Amino acid sequence: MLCAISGKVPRRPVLSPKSRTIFEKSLLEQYVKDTGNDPITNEPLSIEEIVEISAQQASLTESIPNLLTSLQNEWDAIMLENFKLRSTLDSLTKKLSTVMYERDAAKLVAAQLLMEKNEDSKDLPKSSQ
Amino acid sequence: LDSLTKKLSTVMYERDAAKLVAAQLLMEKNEDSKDLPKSSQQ
Amino acid sequence: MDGLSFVDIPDGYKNEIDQLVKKEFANIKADNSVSTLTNALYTEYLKQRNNKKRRTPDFNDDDDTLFLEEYRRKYPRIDTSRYIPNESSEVSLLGIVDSYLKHQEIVLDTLLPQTVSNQWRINNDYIRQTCTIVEEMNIQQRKQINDLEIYRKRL
Amino acid sequence: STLCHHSLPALIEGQRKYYADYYAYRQEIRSLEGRRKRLQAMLNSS
């Protein structure tokens, strides 16, 4: 029901036979020419390998706006989302570094405490003697 | 984005999981001290 | 690595362990021109201005408003033709798309359940493991305490 | 994917947890196993 590249609702969906995943024709045809392989599974795939498989949108009652207001909003919404998405990717990598550092910090505590505990237990076993 | 979120999620979970190792370990280490100290005293 | 979640732990212990982890952290410390204007538009927070002309205009203008007037006619005829083919079908075209949206919605919530079931199923397997070993650790500690006093009472 | 991962890393940690305590128990048994003998040898002198 959606495309597995853009996040569309395809008008001419086509399925690849190497990995069962429906893409919109234009977007899958572009990928194969860029690099001839399936985008998801990274398996060998060509344009002839694809297999082609109706949607209604009710054009608004107030449908000038298509040139001015609607088209403007579309390139606003594309612009401010990807910019905000670039902001999200940058923080995930920073928050990655804080995760791995704190993880390795904990590893050293455990390693330090593994020597501490068993030797404290060992000393109790020796005390009896 | 999502592939990094998997690393983030698996880490944070495993971090606080590994954090509970310390809480346990610290209290047992502590128990070994008073035990031996009170025994070695007498 | 091992820390039993189901079997075991206060907020103070999280605050305690956080400080010990904190102290060990104290120690260690592809597009064309399109992308340039898009990133600049988002960064600056300003959308490029469109043609605010067709809406206002003015009568007895000049050769310039003669064009602007003739624009309003053709688009209003296109408008009135663009409203005719909508009203002909009317609400049938709208409700046919409304039905599609219900098929699209239910599919998502089926996956919400499939994930829900397998997520609870993994946790379900963990639970048994936690209770298996937690007993074995209990067995070990009891035996530990027995020796501890046994060795004393011999001496 | 969390609970999937948590399963795989935990399941290995348990054997290591137990095996440590298992060997920890074995040593404790030895001290128990000898301390008796010294007591047993009190009756020999008598």
Give a verbal description of the structure.
The structure is cut from a larger assembly and holds two copies of chain A, one copy of chain C (155 residues) and one copy of chain D (46 residues). In chain A, strands 2-1-3 form a three-stranded antiparallel sheet. With 129 residues, chain A is mostly helical. Chain A has two helices and three strands. Chain C contains five helices and no strands. The longest helix of chain C has 63 residues, at 92-154. Chain C is elongated. The relative contact order of chain C is 0.06. Chain D has 46 residues and is mainly alpha-helical. Chain D has two helices and no strands. Chain D starts with a helix and ends with a helix. Chains in contact: A-B, A-C, A-D, B-C, B-D, C-D. The C-D interface holds C 1-2, 119, 122-123, 125-126, 129, 133, 136-137, 140, 143-144, 147, 150-151, 154-155 and D 3-4, 6-7, 9-14, 16-18, 21-22, 24-25, 28-29, 31-32, 35-36, 38-39. The PDB classes it as splicing. Keywords: ILS complex, Ntr complex, disassembly, Prp43, splicing. The entry is titled "Cryo-EM structure of the intron-lariat spliceosome ready for disassembly from S.cerevisiae at 3.5 angstrom". Chains A, B: Pre-mRNA-processing factor 19.
Summarize this, please?
This is part of a larger assembly, with 2 copies of chain A, 1 copy of chain C (155 residues) and 1 copy of chain D (46 residues). Chain C has 155 residues and is mainly α. Chain C has helices at 11-28, 33-44, 63-82, 84-89, 92-154.
